[PDB]
């Protein structure tokens, strides 16, 4: 369903998003992305998804 | 592909297997699976996945 989608996620004492990490896994509330060469999880509600 | 697969997980202090979690996502070198409710990441090479 998705290709190459840039998700962006929330830090816990950092109000700021994070970059458009790659698009892994998206299921349950939590969000698997690539933000370079490590994977990372953030949950659905600290995440944003979009199109390239 | 995947529907009920029982995977186990090495730990960094740990040398024993960790329980069957869910699995909810296999690509790269990291393989995302929920032991209950919360859900994490481990590296393929320390991951061990099998069927039900």
Known sequence: MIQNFRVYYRDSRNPLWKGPAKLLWKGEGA?????????????????????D
């Open 31 to 51: 969000v698997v992305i690539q933000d370079n060469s490590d994977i990372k999880v953030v949950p659905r509600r600290k995440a944003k998804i979009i199109r």
